[PDB]
Design a binder for this molecule. Structure first.
Ligand SMILES: Cc1cc(C(=O)NC2CCCC2)[nH]n1
Ligand SMILES: [Mg+2]
Lengths: 410, 410
């Protein structure tokens, strides 16, 4: 197996239109959550979320290119272009067969499907856009980026609900480690903030309804938590074989040493109370890295602010790490960004890499009164400078799909 | 790297509710294409396709469970349950962590999303189903199968448009070969036959409009071809590490020896005329298998019945195989099934495995007048018994995403 390093990162989040602006917000304990302005939610039980604010697609694409593509694809390309620029990588005829893309999404092109449905219901099929299918399907971030940059390596998309970004990054690393590629652009994007999204998650009673204090809604492990906050955005990493990186004098952020997957095999939406599945997933990731659990310094938790999910993740960490559970720091950056669904594992991979770069655990904000058994170092309220040699990032999704990435200082 | 064998197969196709009935139809040159009965298409330019006929979900799930799930999920679970039964595999605490699922879809729950949109616009957001998200998203075939059967191994879904089934099977094989799993259920499902699907493909003028003779619409490499026929269904294979298979006395259909991926990096929907991307993909797959191109006996082509796609595949085969292009047999089973989009590579992987079992090349029906340059053995009209030690299955998709599987007699 070849070693895999991170040489580039890109992001759209509710905290910023790039990685440094997003990370500035994370370290300041800043909320990206606000009343949603782009549609009328007067009649809805949840009227707030994490929007990407001031996104300027024409920095990336022509107006012609942009009008073809659902926002989730625009957000995915934005993060991908940032990551590739950030990497310094030059695509040539000599290497274009060795550079691939795995950018995914949990739900994909809801907004495009809504707009085309309006036309379909009032006028019939002859008013559907000719670009509807290619502009709405999840693999078109990978598609468009490969066409724009001339990437001829492995070209695919993961769709594992709220685990998508973690799985995308993990399986791209495997492509590089086993020699299918030298470089991969990997991560996820999501724009589910439309009637179907807020209505669909609303119908399932999954969302916080703290409309009077949106910035306090997302409160992972707090006793007053009442469901997750819906957010939009994208994260992309350039993953690179280490000798390829060293050969072109690339700036290396960190090393990707481990990837874990598991299924709960439990319930469509609910996690098992003891986090059995998450525990198997983290152990698979540590074994993959060849690490002792005692080597883990920081966990970026799934930590969605759901009653069942938050406690299951505490249980899984205590199971995997035993007494070391009291030495490591664990935080949920979802306290600040909310839940970017399929993009969550991408942006949280990036926050884990920067926790290594800056030797700082991001805070869990709004953790005013930790719930029964939530007695680990959850980095309540304020960022905590500490030694971090190994960082873990967990995602768990609908269908009991689990993913863990292990990152280490290089 | 461990060896990977096929021990089980399952299918819903326009030709049958299982593999044997589907394969019987394939070998008889029978069309599964008919005017669509489940909706009014009077306003649409294409009014026919490959429907699954007489599907009884209650053979698999309760009516209660089924009502929550989009047909693409029902179809994916049906094929998955069949494949696992066909394998003889017994899931226990001893092996459940070593059995995973990778069932994908090109477009996913379009019909469910359309119905929930109609409700949203016409009655309001309180008429969106509470089960809308988990009943519609692409990872929930892998999700629900893992819950029903107790599979705790790697749990994920690919979405690479019309390449999804090929990629799903190929990357599941990699999971087994590199020791992440001993068993994987892999394939794809699609039900895109709704307003948005037929309208979206209609808007792009991608579909055959031979409404007066639906069974003659799908005519790959024929000079009178006028676009692809939209079909619904599912394919699942049980992939298994060879020693695991031998240890439980499993019936082995064939060995999965090679997997290729590539990006065209050419166009969002059109293939390059010379099939450069398809040619790279097949060459990657053959080198992966460690084969001489002259060892290939049968190719199950993508062969969608599009003007550009059909000729590009001939060019790519001539590029990869030189003079051996005239010795091998190549057929499109899409002549009979139509285009199952994300499920196409799954059902066609199964047809390639049975071509090995039965030593027969399936026909390309409706190939009355081969087009200029389409001068290979395309098995026009009737099945051809011949020696087949190695069978290739090609898929190409939107975003220039290519996949090739290589199967060999065991
Ligand atoms: C911020 C930011 C990053 C970019 C960028 O990558 N520019 C595009 C020009 C054509 C493709 C990439 N723009 N704004
Ligand atoms: Mg036919």
């Amino acid at each position: 197996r070849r070693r895999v390093v991170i040489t580039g990162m890109g992001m759209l989040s509710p905290l910023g239109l790039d990685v440094p602006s997003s990370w500035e917000g994370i370290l300041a304990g800043r909320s990206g959550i606000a009343p949603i302005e782009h549609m009328d939610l007067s009649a809805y039980s949840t009227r707030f979320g994490g929007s990407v604010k001031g996104f300027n697609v024409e920095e990336y694409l022509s107006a012609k290119e942009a009008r073809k593509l659902d926002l989730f694809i625009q957000y995915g390309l934005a993060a991908s272009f940032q990551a590739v620029r950030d990497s310094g990588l030059e695509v040539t005829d000599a290497n274009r067969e060795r550079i691939g893309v795995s950018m995914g999404s949990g739900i994909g092109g809801l907004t495009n499907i809504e707009n085309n449905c309006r036309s379909l219901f009032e006028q019939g099929p002859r008013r559907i856009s000719p670009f509807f299918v290619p502009g709405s399907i999840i693999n078109m971030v990978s598609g468009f980026l490969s066409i724009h940059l001339g990437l001829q390596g492995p070209n695919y998309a993961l769709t594992t609900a709220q685990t998508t970004g973690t799985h995308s990054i993990g399986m791209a690393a495997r492509n590089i480690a086993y020699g299918e590629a030298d470089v991969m652009v990997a991560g996820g994007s999501e724009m589910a903030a439309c009637g179907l999204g807020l209505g669909g998650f609303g119908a399932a009673r999954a969302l916080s309804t703290r409309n009077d204090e949106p910035t306090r809604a997302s409160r992972p492990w707090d006793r007053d938590r009442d469901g997750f906050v819906l957010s939009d955005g994208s994260g992309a990493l350039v993953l690179e074989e280490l000798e390829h990186a060293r050969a072109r004098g690339a700036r290396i952020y960190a090393e990707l040493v481990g990837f874990g997957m598991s299924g709960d095999a439990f319930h469509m939406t609910a996690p098992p109370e003891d986090g059995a599945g998450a525990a198997r997933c983290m152990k698979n990731a540590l074994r993959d890295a060849g690490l002792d659990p005692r080597q883990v310094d920081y966990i970026n938790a799934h930590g969605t602010s759901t009653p069942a999910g938050d406690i299951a993740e505490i249980a899984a960490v205590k199971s995997v790490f035993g007494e070391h559970a009291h030495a490591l720091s664990m935080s949920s950056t979802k306290s600040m960004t909310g839940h970017l669904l399929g993009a969550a594992g991408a942006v949280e991979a990036i926050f884990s890499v920067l926790a290594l770069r800056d030797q700082v655990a991001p805070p869990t904000i709004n953790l005013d009164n930790p719930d029964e058994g939530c007695d680990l170092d959850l980095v309540a309220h304020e960022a905590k400078p500490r030694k971090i040699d190994v960082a873990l990032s967990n995602s768990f999704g609908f269908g009991g799909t689990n993913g863990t990435l292990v990152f280490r200082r290089f």
